[PDB]
Each structure stands twice: as C-alpha cells, then as structure tokens.
Amino acid sequence: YIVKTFWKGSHRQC
Amino acid sequence: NMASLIQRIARQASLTFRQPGFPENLSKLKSLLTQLRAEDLNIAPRKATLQPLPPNLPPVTYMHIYETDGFSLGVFLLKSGTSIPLHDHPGMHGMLKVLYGTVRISCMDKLDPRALPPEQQFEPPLQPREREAVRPGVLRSRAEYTEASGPCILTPHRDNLHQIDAVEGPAAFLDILAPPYDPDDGRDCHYYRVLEPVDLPREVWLLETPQADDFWCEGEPYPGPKVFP
Ligand SMILES: [Cl-]
Ligand SMILES: [Co+2]
C-alpha cells in the first residue's frame, strides 16, 4: 500500500 | 533541569530550519549530533542473526521521533546485508549520524540536460524507454561511516542523492530532513539506478526507477526520551 510519509515520501510500505 | 540530548537536538533543528544565522545554527546542530550515542536514544546496538531474512519482514525499519513543518527527525535501522537504495531529497537539506554499525554512503548529484550518446552501451543492456530516460550525474564520494564519524550533510544542490549500505552487519542512523518530504507539494522521494557502461568525483549515468520490490521500510516504536512541544 502507498503511504505519504515525512521520512520516505510516497512510500510503498510492503 | 537539563533537557535530554534528543530534545536539545530537536530544539536546535527547529531553530536552524524554520539566511543570516543559518550556518551558525547548522554548526551547533552538527555539534549536538556529534555527541549523540545510541544509548541516548535507548537503542541497543543490533547484531546479526546469521539467518536468512523471511519474505514477510522488511529489510529496514524506522522510528519516528518528531516532526514539524520545518524538519523531520527519526532513526533508520538496517538489517544485515541490506541497503537503502539510491534516492534524492528534492529541495531539502539532510543530516545523518550513525548510531551503531558501519554504513557505506554513496553520494551523487544530477548534472544540469545532456542526452545519452547513441553508441553508448550498458551491462545489462537498457530497454528503449530507459535509454530515453537516462540522465547524467556525478558520483562525489563513497566512504564508510561509523558512530565515530561526524554527521553527514546533504543539501538541495549537493550530495542530494545517496545510497546507504549496511556493512558487515546491522546498522542504524539518526536522520534529520528539512523540510520533510511532502508529495502533495512536489517533494517526493525518487529512486535511481547508476549504470555501468561497457577516481572520484566521476561522471555517471542515472536512471530514475520505481521503488525496488525487495525494499521497503516499516515503522517500529521509538524507545528513547520523548520530544515535547
Ligand atoms: Cl540481521
Ligand atoms: Co536519504
């Protein structure tokens, strides 16, 4: 899934 | 009384990243990061498992400590044999400090845009869409860093691309990003490949690439002293 993060931008967290 | 070192780091990061006064504030922030040790964050150094990494576990995890509109503050924890792939920090400054372990940090920049010469060949060969998309860059440095090294700095215009490899076991670093990434504001994290055609600094070829299938980062709880408003 994609999460907008402060620390890796639009990150695919999987 | 005396605030925790991580609270003082956050306070100083806020002052530095809200211009005259910036260099002096950045120097003070660097000096605070120089003093930081893993024990000041209640993070015990992690050592290798000597077992293969199962498919359901991330190669890297992240502990968030604090963020404001001006900066983000946290820790990345790399398992043995893992890398954070080559990536940029558009329009941002960054400061990192190794907490335990050894990392190899490769530092690069995109150059000005010049096109790939027609006869240039790569190994592995490039697909047609990749040949159109590759752009020139410069490899500025590639060195190993430990907790005894100073902090490493990047800026919007220098060492803005970096790759971080865990060397000879797990490693972790504190990272400050200023401002934080903001995809909705044109500040996303882009990944790149450096290509081998067929002495530093030296010119390289850079290809923007999707996040690798075997790289992702999951959060885990931060165990150290908390940063308070
Ligand atoms: Cl490990
Ligand atoms: Co980075």
Residue numbers in the entry:
A (entry chain B): 1 to 14
B (entry chain A): 5 to 22, 44 to 137, 144 to 229, 240 to 270
Give the authors' words.
N-terminal cysteine oxidases (NCOs) act as enzymatic oxygen (O2) sensors, coordinating cellular changes to hypoxia in animals and plants. They regulate the O2-dependent stability of proteins bearing an N-terminal cysteine residue through the N-degron pathway. In animals, the Cys branch of the N-degron pathway is regulated by the NCO 2-aminoethanethiol dioxygenase (ADO), which also plays a role in cysteamine catabolism and taurine biosynthesis. Biochemically, ADO is a non-haem iron-dependent thiol dioxygenase (TDO) from the cupin fold family of enzymes, consisting of a conserved double stranded β-helix (DSBH) core in which the active site is situated.
To overcome these issues, CP6 was used as a molecular scaffold to graft substrate moieties, anticipating that its binding and inhibition properties would enhance substrate complex formation by increasing association and reducing turnover. CP6-L8 protrudes into the active site of ADO without contributing to binding, rendering it a viable site for substrate moiety installation. In the first instance, CP6-L8 was replaced with ornithine (Orn; O) or lysine (Lys), allowing the sidechain amine to be coupled to Cys or serine (Ser), the latter of which is an amenable substrate analogue. This generated a pseudo-N-terminus with conformational and rotational flexibility, which could reach the ADO active site metal (a distance of 7.5 Å). The association of these CP6-substituents was assessed by SPR using SCK, revealing that Cys and Ser conjugated to a Lys sidechain enhanced binding relative to unmodified CP6. The Ser residue of CP6-L8K-Ser coordinates the metal centre in a bidentate arrangement through ligation of both the hydroxyl and amine group, leaving one water molecule trans to ADO-H112, which is the putative site of oxygen binding and activation. The water molecule trans to ADO-H112 also forms a hydrogen bond with ADO-D206, which points towards the metal centre through an additional interaction with the amine of CP6-L8K-Ser. The crystal structures of cobalt-incorporated ADO in complex with CP6-L8K-Ser and CP6-L8d-Gly-Ser provide valuable information on substrate analogue binding. However, they do not reflect native conditions in which an iron cofactor interacts with an Nt-Cys residue.
